[PDB]
Amino acid sequence: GNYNYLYRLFRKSNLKPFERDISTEIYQAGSTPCNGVKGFNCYFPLQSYG
Amino acid sequence: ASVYAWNRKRISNCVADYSVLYNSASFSTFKCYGVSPTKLNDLCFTNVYA
């Protein structure tokens, strides 16, 4: 599998037309802030096609 | 249940507060297919089976 091709799975809000965003900061799905690290309902935003 | 003879109950005619499930860090796995877990507090279904 070629894992180098990725998509953003999570974001705080949906993109505007031709908006571009390369941030890799943790997405807070949970009731509690994520302290900038992975955990329960605290996810890394980029995922792979492999 | 033993896995060769799994238990099932027909969940119907009720409000499914999926947040009581996905807010709980007790679960070692919580994968939802086709839909993100937070969206389940908005959606509707004919039945659910456990």
Resolution in A: 3.3
Which residues touch B19 (CB under 8 Å, ≥6 apart)?
B38, B41
B21 touches chain A (CB under 8 A): no
Do the Cβ atoms of A49 and A9 come closer than 8 Å? no
Q: Closest Cα of chain B to A45: distance in Å?
A: 14
Name the helix (H) or strand (E) containing A47: strand A46-48
- Could you tell me which residues of chain A have a Cβ less than 8 Å from any Cβ in chain B? 29-31, 40-41
Distances (CA, A) of B10 to A10, A25, A28, A35: 32, 40, 33, 40
Report CA-CA distances (Å) from B23 to A14, A42, B10.
Answer: 23, 12, 23
Residue of B nearest to A30 (CA): B23
